[PDB]
Design a protein around this nucleic acid. Structure first.
Ligand SMILES: [Mg+2]
Ligand SMILES: [Mg+2]
Ligand SMILES: [Mg+2]
Ligand SMILES: [Mg+2]
Ligand SMILES: [Mg+2]
Ligand SMILES: [Mg+2]
Ligand SMILES: [Mg+2]
Ligand SMILES: [Mg+2]
Ligand SMILES: [Mg+2]
Ligand SMILES: [Mg+2]
Ligand SMILES: [Mg+2]
Ligand SMILES: [Mg+2]
Ligand SMILES: [Mg+2]
Ligand SMILES: [Mg+2]
Ligand SMILES: [Mg+2]
Ligand SMILES: [Mg+2]
Ligand SMILES: [Mg+2]
Ligand SMILES: [Mg+2]
Ligand SMILES: [Mg+2]
Ligand SMILES: [Mg+2]
Ligand SMILES: [Mg+2]
Ligand SMILES: [Mg+2]
Ligand SMILES: [Mg+2]
Ligand SMILES: [Mg+2]
Lengths: 175, 135, 177, 49, 104, 74
RNA sequence: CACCCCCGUGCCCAUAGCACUGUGGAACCACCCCACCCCAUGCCGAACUGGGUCGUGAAACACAGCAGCGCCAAUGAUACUCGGACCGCAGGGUCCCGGAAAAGUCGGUCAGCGCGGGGGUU
RNA sequence: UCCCAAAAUGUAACGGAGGCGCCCAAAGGUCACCUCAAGACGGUUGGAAAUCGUCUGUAGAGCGCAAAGGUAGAAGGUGG
């Protein structure tokens, strides 16, 4: 993720594939321009549950995590992005997608599986280690049943920041 | 459709959409690209058409809701009374606001239901997928 | 009368149960409260001025009337009317009523084997309920044949629900098995 | 209507009227106050008439 | 609740008058009876019972009153406003006033 | 029920403003309750209008939302 | 202001407040202590209150730890908008120049300043 | 009285809402003292809601009526 320039304050930010952004933590807080194509080609494949290292010209490569993007309503084009500086140890309240595996009852004989919460906010005390996904096997539950967060297994030392009892997936009756 | 209590009269102004969150709830959605009023007539028409394409399905929210009383005056008269009663409620819809939202169907089988819904609505609209997560 | 006999049972309550750092940490009784509710049949001034007289004969205190507040209701409830007699009492005026109730009152219900056990508050505070007032020799049944009841609240310190098992046990109150 | 009324006040042997009368709702027959006529002293005002 | 003391420490304004405030503490056997120029964050002429007063406890009333009046007459202080506290005004705390202007 | 009704303007508002020299008896703000509160050097009328007792430079005090005061500095 | 610590009373005017919590004890404070009378409860010394030590720091209060709750809260980008100049039949939109939130994320804090009095290391 | 009314005041419409033509011998002066909704457990005939009792309780009440402002140190509730 090479960066040519880091503009100060309101600048040209040409629509020649330039996106404003920042990265910030306790100490340093840098500057703007990125790249629409390289960013969004990277932002899809790295979700928000994982990092990539950017560097303005000169030897300053440095870890960062995508956190909050801001884009054009009345459009779908990203305009601005926030990065948080990775610390290599302290826990970070990373979001994690909830996926699914297998065919449940209803998925064979009845209604559809429903991911009632697409993204949990587990604390995951992991520097480099993050869960890019979170698989939830459903071949068990029947119509009317719903898996809550208490039995959403959390990989390798990662506490849940949500309620134990809140519903996360729920096979639902047809129609 | 109609709401249960109110006040019952209003007005008119416009600017671009405040809170149109993309895809909460569903996987896929349709999204207005022009400002308009939209009728409970037209919302329920989109409902009744998309139900037929997803028969026993059940994957349809309506994150949009008629709300504004609007008041055609009686048909004979010169200007003079106050206002007519309301006929027909409408919800405002600014570009980039999401209106429709299905989940759990193949793209093409949802894209076709959105095409059928967009021929019933008074605005140009777009069909979309996923990316952004706010909070 | 019953004062040190109270205090010669609370001091043993210090011992066999727990081990508080302080004699002031001990469970103890604040006040006994009596609430007649004459609004179940509110006379315009007939019995309502009399029930205060009988409750006052019980205690040597003049009852206050807990009048209704706004809150008009299904059973037609204009605000200002009287609805409930109340007498709070403490110390010497109180322990006479309490020994009088452990004495000839509570034991002499026709159907009696103790009151509801160990279910009062999340705090240790407690509350007794009277079935009817027909358990007295201070009134003759022949006159007011349709005599009513009353409701008592036994106020006490305690942080723990299991620490209520002294205000009644080591004081002279049976409770159910 | 009428209930509240106007009512003149007359000094205990003075003159000075003052005519600010209030309700006949609860003051069924009462009406006495005090304020000064032409003698300096505040005096008794019988508000009969 | 105690809302009573704030109503009297407001009821006598800070100074729209130039007078002086005289806040007692007759909640113990520890009365302080201070004199306060509220315009400056300063206290002037206190009269504690706190060092003995010969073991008089509510009887000290007159003694702390005359000790205040002696402490303040020495400094040129003759305009008073008697700031009560939580307290009523009849006996123990009333005597501090009766003694404060017998000899103020 | 045709409801053509309404009520004459009430010239409410802040009259004398911050840093204006004033006089005794000047009316300094008009209000319904006590949006601005009396304060030192400043009285308050029966209709809750606060107004000067002394002459001079004026007020400026506003930290308490719902606790804002007018005053006069000699 | 030699260092602490306590009682009263102010400025500030939740970055100082709550909860979980630990320390405190006859120096101060507080509960318990008895009340025919001063005084008093629309019943009750629970409160006012009038006479006092022990007893206990239990309760309350004081002070520490604490960032789970609140409260404060950037930078960046926006939203809007003074003035300048335009597009669309219209609903509505754009460009230049300055001004610029709200919410959120980074974070920040379980305060800071007085005055008088009391007892301490004797 | 409140929108409209374009963050000063002002501002039309056979625009949109709603009140007044009174009350109060105390609902006034002052002096003193109390602090409200609402919910949860537990309680005599009442039990969704009488009344008591504990805990929560910037207020979610109340202020003679319409609304708006304001109000917890009270204008609210009570006595001399
Ligand atoms: Mg417009
Ligand atoms: Mg617009
Ligand atoms: Mg715009
Ligand atoms: Mg939003
Ligand atoms: Mg009409
Ligand atoms: Mg202190
Ligand atoms: Mg010691
Ligand atoms: Mg006592
Ligand atoms: Mg303690
Ligand atoms: Mg505690
Ligand atoms: Mg900025
Ligand atoms: Mg312009
Ligand atoms: Mg044209
Ligand atoms: Mg300019
Ligand atoms: Mg600009
Ligand atoms: Mg902000
Ligand atoms: Mg945070
Ligand atoms: Mg602390
Ligand atoms: Mg000091
Ligand atoms: Mg205006
Ligand atoms: Mg204007
Ligand atoms: Mg005109
Ligand atoms: Mg109109
Ligand atoms: Mg008052």
């Amino acid at each position: 993720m090479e960066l040519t320039a880091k503009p100060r304050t309101p600048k040209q930010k040409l629509d020649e594939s330039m996106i404003a952004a920042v990265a910030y933590n306790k100490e340093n807080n840098v500057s703007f321009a990125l790249d629409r194509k390289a960013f969004d080609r990277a932002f899809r494949q790295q979700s928000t549950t994982g990092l990539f290292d950017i560097t303005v010209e000169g030897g300053e490569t440095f870890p960062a995590l995508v956190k909050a993007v801001q884009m054009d309503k009345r459009k779908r084009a990203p305009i601005h992005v926030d990065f948080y500086m990775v610390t290599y140890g302290e826990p970070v309240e990373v979001s994690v997608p909830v996926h699914t595996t297998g065919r449940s009852q209803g998925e064979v004989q009845g209604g559809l599986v429903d991911i009632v919460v697409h993204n949990l906010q587990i604390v995951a005390p992991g520097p480099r280690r993050i869960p890019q996904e979170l698989v939830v096997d459903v071949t068990k539950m029947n119509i009317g049943d719903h898996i809550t967060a208490g039995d959403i297994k959390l990989p390798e030392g990662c506490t849940l920041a949500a309620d134990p009892e809140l519903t996360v997936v729920s096979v639902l009756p047809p129609r | 459709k109609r709401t249960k209590f109110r006040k019952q009269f209003r007005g008119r102004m416009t600017g671009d959409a405040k809170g149109g969150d993309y895809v909460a709830f569903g996987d896929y959605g349709l999204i207005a690209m022009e400002p308009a009023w939209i009728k409970s007539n037209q919302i329920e028409a989109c409902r009744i058409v998309m139900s037929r394409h997803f028969r026993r399905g059940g994957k349809i929210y309506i994150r949009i809701f008629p709300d504004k009383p609007v008041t055609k005056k009686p048909a004979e008269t010169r200007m003079g009374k106050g206002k007519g009663a309301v006929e027909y409620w409408v919800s405002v819809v600014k570009p980039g606001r999401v209106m429709f939202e299905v989940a759990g169907v193949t793209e093409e089988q949802a894209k076709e239901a959105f095409r059928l819904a967009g021929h019933k609505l008074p605005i140009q609209t777009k069909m979309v997928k996923r990316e952004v997560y706010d909070e | 009368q019953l004062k040190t006999k109270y205090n010669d049972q609370v001091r043993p309550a210090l011992m066999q149960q727990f081990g508080y750092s302080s004699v002031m940490a001990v469970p103890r009784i604040e006040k006994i409260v009596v609430n007649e509710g004459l609004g179940s049949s509110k006379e315009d001034s007939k019995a309502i001025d009399k029930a205060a007289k009988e409750l006052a004969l019980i205690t040597l205190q003049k009852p206050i009337i807990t009048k209704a507040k706004k809150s008009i209701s299904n059973f037609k409830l204009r605000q200002g009317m009287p609805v409930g007699i109340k007498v709070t009492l403490r110390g010497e005026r109180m322990y006479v009523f309490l020994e009088k109730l452990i004495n000839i009152g509570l034991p002499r219900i026709r159907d009696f084997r103790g009151i509801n056990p160990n279910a009062f508050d999340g705090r240790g505070n407690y509350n007794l309920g009277i079935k009817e007032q027909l358990i007295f020799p201070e009134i003759t049944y022949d006159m007011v044949d349709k005599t009513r009841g009353m409701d008592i609240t036994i106020v006490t310190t305690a942080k723990t629900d299991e620490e209520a098992r002294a205000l009644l046990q080591s004081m002279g109150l049976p409770f159910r098995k | 209507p009428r209930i509240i009324v106007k009512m003149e006040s007359s000094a205990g042997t003075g003159f000075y009227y003052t005519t600010t009368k209030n309700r006949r709702n609860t003051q069924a027959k009462l009406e006495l106050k005090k304020y000064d006529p032409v003698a300096k002293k505040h005096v008794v005002f019988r508000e009969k008439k | 609740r105690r809302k009573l003391r704030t109503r009297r420490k407001v009821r006598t304004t800070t100074a729209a008058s130039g007078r002086l405030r005289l806040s007692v503490y007759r909640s113990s056997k520890h009365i302080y009876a201070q004199i306060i120029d509220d315009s400056r964050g300063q206290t002037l002429a206190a009269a504690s019972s706190a060092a003995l007063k010969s073991g008089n406890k509510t009887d000290t009333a007159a003694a702390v009153g005359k000790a205040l009046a002696a402490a303040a007459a020495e400094k040129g202080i003759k305009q008073v406003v008697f700031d009560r506290g939580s307290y009523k005004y009849h006996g123990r705390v009333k005597a501090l006033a009766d003694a404060a202007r017998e000899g103020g | 029920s045709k409801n053509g009704r309404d009520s004459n303007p009430k010239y409410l508002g802040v009259k004398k403003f911050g840093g204006e020299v004033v006089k005794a008896g000047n009316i300094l703000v008009r209000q319904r309750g006590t949006k601005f509160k009396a304060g030192q050097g400043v009285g308050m009328g029966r209709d809750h209008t606060l107004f000067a007792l002394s002459d001079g430079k004026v007020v400026f005090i506003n930290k308490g939302k719902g606790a804002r005061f007018i005053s006069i500095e000699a």
